[PDB]
Amino acid sequence: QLDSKLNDLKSLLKEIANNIK
Amino acid sequence: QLDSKLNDLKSLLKEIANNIK
């Protein structure tokens, strides 16, 4: 469960990077 | 503890992205 939570939080960085650009 | 530490470090990227924008 913790590994899945970390993986899910990972995509937030990509989403933020896409939004900023 | 290590998983929690990694999760906490994760939010730093989002904070930096918000600050830069």
Swiss-Prot record, chains A, B:
Record remark: domains: Cooling agents bind within a pocket formed entirely by the S1-S4 helices that opens to the cytoplasm.
Tissue expr: Expressed in dorsal root and trigeminal ganglia. Specifically expressed in a subset of pain- and temperature-sensing neurons. Not expressed in heavily myelinated neurons. Not expressed in neurons expressing TRPA1 or TRPV1.
Function, in words: Non-selective ion channel permeable to monovalent and divalent cations, including Na(+), K(+), and Ca(2+), with higher permeability for Ca(2+). Activated by multiple factors, such as temperature, voltage, pressure, and changes in osmolality. Activated by cool temperatures (<23-28 degrees Celsius) and by chemical ligands evoking a sensation of coolness, such as menthol and icilin, therefore plays a central role in the detection of environmental cold temperatures.
Loss of function: phenotype: Trpm8-deficient mice have severe behavioral deficits in response to cold stimuli.
Listed name of the protein: Transient receptor potential cation channel subfamily M member 8
Subcellular location: Cell membrane; Membrane raft
PTM entry text: N-glycosylation is not essential for but facilitates cell surface expression, multimerization, association with lipid rafts and ion channel activity.
Subunit note: Homotetramer. Interacts (via N-terminus and C-terminus domains) with TCAF1; the interaction stimulates TRPM8 channel activity. Interacts (via N-terminus and C-terminus domains) with TCAF2; the interaction inhibits TRPM8 channel activity.
Family membership noted in the UniProt record: Belongs to the transient receptor (TC 1.A.4) family. LTrpC subfamily. TRPM8 sub-subfamily.
